Design an enzyme around this catalytic site. Structure first.
Site, PDB file in Angstrom:
ATOM      1  N   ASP A 232       0.875  -1.188   0.000  1.00 58.40           N
ATOM      2  CA  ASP A 232       0.000   0.000   0.000  1.00 58.40           C
ATOM      3  C   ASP A 232       0.911   1.236   0.000  1.00 58.40           C
ATOM      4  O   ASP A 232       0.656   2.212  -0.727  1.00 58.40           O
ATOM      5  CB  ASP A 232      -0.934   0.050   1.218  1.00 58.40           C
ATOM      6  CG  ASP A 232      -1.888  -1.138   1.293  1.00 58.40           C
ATOM      7  OD1 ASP A 232      -2.376  -1.602   0.240  1.00 58.40           O
ATOM      8  OD2 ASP A 232      -2.148  -1.617   2.425  1.00 58.40           O
ATOM      9  N   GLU A 500     -13.799   2.194   4.683  1.00 58.66           N
ATOM     10  CA  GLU A 500     -14.027   1.992   3.240  1.00 58.66           C
ATOM     11  C   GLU A 500     -15.483   1.597   3.082  1.00 58.66           C
ATOM     12  O   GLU A 500     -15.923   0.575   3.635  1.00 58.66           O
ATOM     13  CB  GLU A 500     -13.133   0.881   2.716  1.00 58.66           C
ATOM     14  CG  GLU A 500     -11.662   1.228   2.686  1.00 58.66           C
ATOM     15  CD  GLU A 500     -10.757   0.024   2.469  1.00 58.66           C
ATOM     16  OE1 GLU A 500     -10.968  -1.058   3.058  1.00 58.66           O
ATOM     17  OE2 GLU A 500      -9.782   0.168   1.715  1.00 58.66           O
ATOM     18  N   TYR A 611      -9.879  -7.536  -1.717  1.00 60.68           N
ATOM     19  CA  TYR A 611     -10.701  -6.466  -2.271  1.00 60.68           C
ATOM     20  C   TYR A 611     -11.453  -6.979  -3.524  1.00 60.68           C
ATOM     21  O   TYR A 611     -10.941  -7.795  -4.283  1.00 60.68           O
ATOM     22  CB  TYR A 611      -9.845  -5.231  -2.607  1.00 60.68           C
ATOM     23  CG  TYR A 611      -9.441  -4.356  -1.422  1.00 60.68           C
ATOM     24  CD1 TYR A 611      -9.080  -4.910  -0.195  1.00 60.68           C
ATOM     25  CD2 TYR A 611      -9.443  -2.964  -1.532  1.00 60.68           C
ATOM     26  CE1 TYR A 611      -8.729  -4.121   0.873  1.00 60.68           C
ATOM     27  CE2 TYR A 611      -9.082  -2.162  -0.469  1.00 60.68           C
ATOM     28  CZ  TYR A 611      -8.716  -2.741   0.728  1.00 60.68           C
ATOM     29  OH  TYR A 611      -8.375  -1.958   1.818  1.00 60.68           O
TER      30      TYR A 611
HETATM   31  C1  LIG Z   1      -4.750   5.030   0.846  1.00 57.57           C
HETATM   32  C2  LIG Z   1      -4.313   3.678   1.330  1.00 57.57           C
HETATM   33  O1  LIG Z   1      -3.250   3.541   1.936  1.00 57.57           O
HETATM   34  N1  LIG Z   1      -5.197   2.693   1.034  1.00 57.57           N
HETATM   35  C3  LIG Z   1      -5.063   1.270   1.363  1.00 57.57           C
HETATM   36  C4  LIG Z   1      -5.780   0.917   2.684  1.00 57.57           C
HETATM   37  C5  LIG Z   1      -5.426   1.814   3.891  1.00 57.57           C
HETATM   38  O2  LIG Z   1      -3.987   1.924   4.042  1.00 57.57           O
HETATM   39  C6  LIG Z   1      -6.099   1.322   5.191  1.00 57.57           C
HETATM   40  O3  LIG Z   1      -7.509   1.615   5.159  1.00 57.57           O
HETATM   41  C7  LIG Z   1      -5.487   1.964   6.438  1.00 57.57           C
HETATM   42  O4  LIG Z   1      -6.202   1.551   7.608  1.00 57.57           O
HETATM   43  O5  LIG Z   1      -5.457  -0.431   3.039  1.00 57.57           O
HETATM   44  C8  LIG Z   1      -5.568  -1.448   1.999  1.00 57.57           C
HETATM   45  C9  LIG Z   1      -5.732  -2.850   2.469  1.00 57.57           C
HETATM   46  O6  LIG Z   1      -5.736  -3.797   1.668  1.00 57.57           O
HETATM   47  O7  LIG Z   1      -5.911  -3.096   3.687  1.00 57.57           O
HETATM   48  C10 LIG Z   1      -5.585  -1.094   0.685  1.00 57.57           C
HETATM   49  C11 LIG Z   1      -5.643   0.367   0.246  1.00 57.57           C
HETATM   50  O8  LIG Z   1      -5.016   0.560  -1.048  1.00 57.57           O
END
Ligand SMILES: CC(=O)N[C@H]1[C@H]([C@H](O)[C@H](O)CO)OC(C(=O)O)=C[C@@H]1O
Length: 656
Positions: A232, A500, A611
């Site tokens: 990430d 999310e 995801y």
């Molecule tokens: C902007 C960003 O970093 N997005 C990432 C998200 C985030 O870091 C997490 O919500 C922090 O709590 O985590 C994940 C994950 O698969 O868990 C994927 C996303 O691409």
């Protein structure tokens, strides 16, 4: 050509002796074995074949290729007397079932004593190649006397019994070359990839899929093209797109849609070993986590988070928007090299102003955040990455525009996260330049983080709703003027949820936001005034996930199911990890409660599922793209070709 070839060998744990056929065939000791199989039961550890010393005391003297119940493909090569034990493998290498049927996979192993490497292939991809110091071929293992299909004979007993049909199995007494074996393992699973390692994007890795169906009947995908493994952060990430004009049967070669060029879009072999997998690209600017929505006037929006080089979810200051207010207007701040304060703003026409004197400077910032001086572009050298387990980020001699999101810029934005959006008038063929979102959370707060997937147009008001989160709150970004301007409803959550979210409409003016939490459950919040005020969270009773949670997908569906308006939900459902993907159909009742009537397990319960994204196809089937691996696990980092697209009829989803 094969030293042995057998076909349609159905087995249920018992195996089949082929010692007579293979004893005396393996002259050098090297070998290649290609196996087209399907499993009738995924449970336990299962060997597709085994070459062993079957005698008592020699149970650690064998070669095999094995399958685990989580989709891992591996191989062992062991010798008892020298206590040499090789194990090479990769998670999430095969498929189990699809729509009630055992899935045919084709896998292969190559043992090459010249290179001292074992290689494994599955479904067109070389999933792993490992040079080993204690290399063993067949001739290196003392007293090999037994060759078996569907097991390993250990001390006169059948171990690792395979359950299924070996459709075809080929044994070769040499190491076949890479391109041949990739071709031999290619099959129907191979064609479920829209984005592939080192395709037109130049990226070896992808995460965070998004699917959306436009009003004209085009089906559209976006995805994170992650170049420095699947981290990430920190990482170098572009947003890629690809579309289908035929209900999903065929897809365009992927294009880069949001990208910075401080690093080039080039394939990197990211190390998966424990000692290198934590490595990151540290110096590169990033777009991450895309959201798509189509307006009523058929214009399409895409949002994405923007990270300057060195900044992530983790580093970003939470106490600064990156904007300044000057005579009731918001302008992005900049800090010039050698200054400690932020003395400059970008104002009209991208003109850079010295805020101290309130005068325009000779500098300006273009629509893609590139820096000019006297109307000519400033340049910086682009970086490349090089390995050996020694990673180096180095300047490569190519010049690219200097950009305010870069490490080596003369003027730099505040090191926090931003949101950008782009618009398309031709259903995703072409896109406007990125607009950064204004400081809707306030001047003294960083922007929220997008909830990947789609936004919605609430039907009673025409309000546009984009889901995001802060780590403590939900942030429902909205526009009441068809996208000209944006506001936010901030909703404090019960705890520190990575919230999310995705929306559905139950009835006119009534919407629900379904989201990830830190408590193990999926939460949903209801508004009955088109998003202006939100109820207290309720939780789905039938999903149980780890405390960290995973992103979900939920969509409205256009056709009645059992005479009722319906929604369709995709999520993992397992407390053991990001596993056990399910699709749920929920039927809306007259009182706006949902009857969660049907569910469908995508594959077996220990298989990876992270995801995901759903869309209704023009023909009213359902498209699903998802991460077929555990994207949280440190063991399943930096894997190629693990994000497939599949489809379901409603009648398929009613089963399970
Ligand atoms: C902007 C960003 O970093 N997005 C990432 C998200 C985030 O870091 C997490 O919500 C922090 O709590 O985590 C994940 C994950 O698969 O868990 C994927 C996303 O691409």
């Amino acid at each position: 050509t094969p030293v042995l070839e057998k076909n349609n060998v159905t087995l249920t744990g018992g195996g089949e002796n082929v010692t007579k056929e293979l004893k005396d065939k393996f002259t050098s000791g090297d070998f290649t074995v290609v196996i087209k199989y399907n499993q009738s039961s995924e449970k336990g550890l299962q060997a597709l074949f085994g070459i062993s010393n079957s005698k008592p005391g020699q149970q650690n003297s064998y070669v095999d290729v094995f399958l685990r119940d989580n989709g891992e493909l591996g191989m062992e090569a062991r010798d008892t007397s020298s206590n040499k034990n090789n194990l090479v493998s990769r998670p999430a290498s095969v498929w189990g079932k699809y729509k009630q049927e055992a899935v045919t996979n084709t896998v292969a192993v190559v043992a090459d004593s010249v290179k001292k490497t074992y290689s494994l292939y599955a479904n067109g991809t070389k999933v792993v190649e490992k040079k080993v110091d204690n290399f063993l071929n067949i001739k290196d293992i003392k007293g090999i006397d037994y060759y078996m299909l569907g097991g390993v004979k250990r001390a006169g007993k059948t171990a690792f019994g395979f359950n299924g049909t070996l459709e075809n199995i080929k044994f070769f007494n040499s190491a076949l070359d890479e391109e041949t074996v990739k071709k031999m393992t290619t099959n129907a699973v191979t064609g479920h990839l829209i984005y592939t390692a080192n395709d037109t994007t130049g990226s070896n890795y992808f995460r965070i899929p998004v699917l959306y169906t436009f009003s004209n009947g085009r089906v559209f995908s976006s995805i994170d093209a992650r170049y420095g493994g699947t981290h990430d952060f920190l990482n170098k990430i572009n947003i890629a797109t690809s579309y289908s004009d035929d209900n999903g049967k065929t897809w365009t070669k992927p294009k880069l849609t949001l990208a910075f060029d401080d690093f080039a879009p080039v394939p990197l072999e990211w190390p998966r070993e424990v000692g290198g997998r934590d490595l990151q690209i540290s110096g590169g600017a990033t777009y991450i986590d895309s959201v798509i929505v189509e307006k009523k006037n058929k214009q399409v929006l895409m949002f994405a988070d923007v990270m300057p080089a060195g900044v992530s979810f983790r580093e970003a200051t939470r106490k600064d928007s990156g904007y300044k207010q000057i005579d009731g207007n918001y302008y992005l701040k900049l800090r010039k090299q050698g200054d400690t304060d932020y003395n400059y703003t970008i104002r009209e026409n991208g003109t850079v102003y010295d805020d101290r004197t309130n005068r325009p400077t000779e500098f300006s910032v273009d629509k893609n955040f590139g820096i000019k001086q006297n109307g000519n572009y400033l340049t910086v050298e682009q970086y490349s990455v090089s390995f050996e387990n020694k990673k180096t980020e180095y300047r490569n001699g190519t010049k690219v525009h200097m950009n305010i999101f870069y490490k080596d810029a003369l003027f730099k934005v505040v090191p926090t996260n931003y949101i950008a959006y782009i618009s398309s008038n031709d259903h995703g063929e072409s896109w406007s330049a990125p607009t950064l979102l204004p400081p809707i959370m306030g001047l003294n707060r960083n922007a929220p983080y997008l909830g990947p997937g789609r936004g919605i147009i609430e039907s009673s008001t025409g309000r546009i709703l984009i889901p995001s989160y802060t780590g403590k709150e939900s942030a429902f970004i909205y526009s009441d003027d068809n996208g000209a301007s944006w506001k936010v409803k901030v909703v404090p959550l019960p705890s520190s949820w990575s919230a999310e979210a995705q929306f559905v409409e139950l009835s006119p003016g009534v919407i629900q936001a379904y989201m990830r939490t830190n408590n193990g459950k999926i939460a949903y919040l209801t508004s009955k005034d088109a998003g202006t005020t939100w109820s207290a969270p309720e939780y789905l009773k039938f999903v149980s996930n780890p405390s960290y949670g995973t992103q979900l997908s939920i969509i409205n569906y256009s056709q009645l199911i059992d005479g009722k308006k319906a929604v369709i939900l995709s999520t993992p459902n397992s407390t053991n990890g990001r596993k056990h993907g399910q699709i749920w159909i929920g039927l809306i009742n007259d009182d706006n409660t949902i009857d969660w009537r049907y569910h469908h397990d995508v594959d077996y319960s220990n298989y990876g599922y992270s995801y995901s994204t759903l869309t209704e196809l023009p023909n009213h089937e359902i498209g699903l793209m998802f991460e077929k691996f555990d994207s949280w696990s440190r063991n399943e980092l930096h894997m190629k070709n693990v994000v497939p697209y599949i489809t379901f009829k409603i009648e398929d989803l009613k089963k399970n």
